[PDB]
């Protein structure tokens, strides 16, 4: 039941810099006082960011294919951007996993689902209810479910600083999905600040389906509604990094190889 909104504007696909973001822990192991090399699909330094500035007129809910995972980031003030439609064909026939919440606990579910053209959370501004969480349409040839930590999680609309910064990495790997978490207090008007934040090896998943397409999920303030917020898209690249661990076991500096002759000389 493609309960699809119509005032979903096309932006000019606003472009930004991918300066120093996307660093995580490649191993599961302490080290100290090294320069560690590894070869992996990382977001390069300084590269493009296709940022999506959904505003009071412009709404940003496209469909995007997978394409070596994404560096993901979202500036939400009490959590609009829950949900990812990591699907195959975006119809009833789709090998789709959906990453959503029951506002307390994290509900992730893979099956051949009916993918509507825009299912929406009919979220109101002062309360924040998923009254129309109609996404669980069909169940035929079903695969998988998962329920994570129940933790502190809000819905409703705020403003101020970009209070919650979701720095995520979504990375397909040998069938699995590897999903990382960061957090940062940031305050920019609408855009990305300059800074790095080490992402944590949080969620590794046994899924194993051909994940082609994806959509993002926001909260349509019930007719939609958005706050002063933005969210970003970055693509990964099979490059080589030299990391600098400290004695605390905290990433303090990263250096790509395929970026600058000085950068590869640093990793040389």
């Amino acid at each position: 039941r493609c309960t699809t909104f119509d005032d979903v504007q096309a932006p000019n696909y606003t472009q930004h810099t991918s300066s120093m973001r996307g660093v995580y822990y490649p191993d599961e192991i302490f080290r100290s006082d090294t320069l560690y090399l590894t070869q992996d699909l990382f977001l390069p330094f300084y590269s493009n960011v296709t940022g999506f500035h959904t505003i009071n007129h412009t709404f940003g809910n496209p469909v995007i294919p997978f394409k070596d995972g994404i560096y993901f980031a979202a500036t939400e003030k009490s959590n609009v951007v829950r949900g990812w439609v990591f699907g195959s064909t975006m119809n009833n026939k789709s090998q789709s996993v959906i990453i959503i919440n029951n506002s307390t606990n994290v509900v992730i579910r893979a099956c051949n689902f009916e993918l509507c053209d825009n299912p929406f959370f009919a979220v109101s501004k002062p309360m924040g209810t998923q009254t129309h969480t109609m996404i669980f349409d069909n169940a035929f040839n079903c695969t998988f479910e998962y329920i994570s930590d129940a933790f502190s999680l809000d819905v409703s609309e705020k403003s101020g600083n970009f209070k919650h910064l979701r720095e995520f990495v979504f990375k397909n790997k040998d069938g699995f999905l590897y999903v990382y978490k960061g957090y940062q207090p940031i305050d920019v008007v609408r855009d990305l600040p300059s800074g790095f934040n080490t992402l944590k090896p949080i969620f590794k998943l046994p899924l194993g389906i051909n994940i082609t397409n994806f959509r993002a999920i926001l909260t349509a303030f019930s007719i939609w509604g958005t706050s002063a917020a933005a969210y970003f898209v970055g693509y990964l690249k099979p490059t080589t990094f030299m990391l600098k661990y400290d004695e605390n076991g905290t990433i303090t500096d990263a250096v790509d190889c395929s970026q600058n002759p000085l950068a590869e000389l640093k990793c040389s």
């Binding site: 195959s88 064909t89 026939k93 090998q95 051949n112 040839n141 695969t143 040998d174 069938g175 699995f176 194993g208 389906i209 051909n210």
Partner: protein, 48 residues
């Protein structure tokens, strides 16, 4: 025992540990067909 099957028509190879239940009525350039159309079959194949 024709109850269980396999699939034998696809655009190419795969990455490890990856699965599609989707009965695609295959045609060699996309083209969602209804068999019995030309180059339009289904991949289902019994075990004998």
């Amino acid at each position: 025992n024709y109850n269980y099957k396999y699939r034998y028509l696809r655009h190419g190879k795969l990455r490890p540990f990856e699965r599609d239940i989707s009965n695609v009525p295959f045609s060699p350039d996309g083209k969602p067909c209804t068999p019995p159309a030309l180059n339009c079959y289904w991949p289902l194949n019994d075990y004998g």
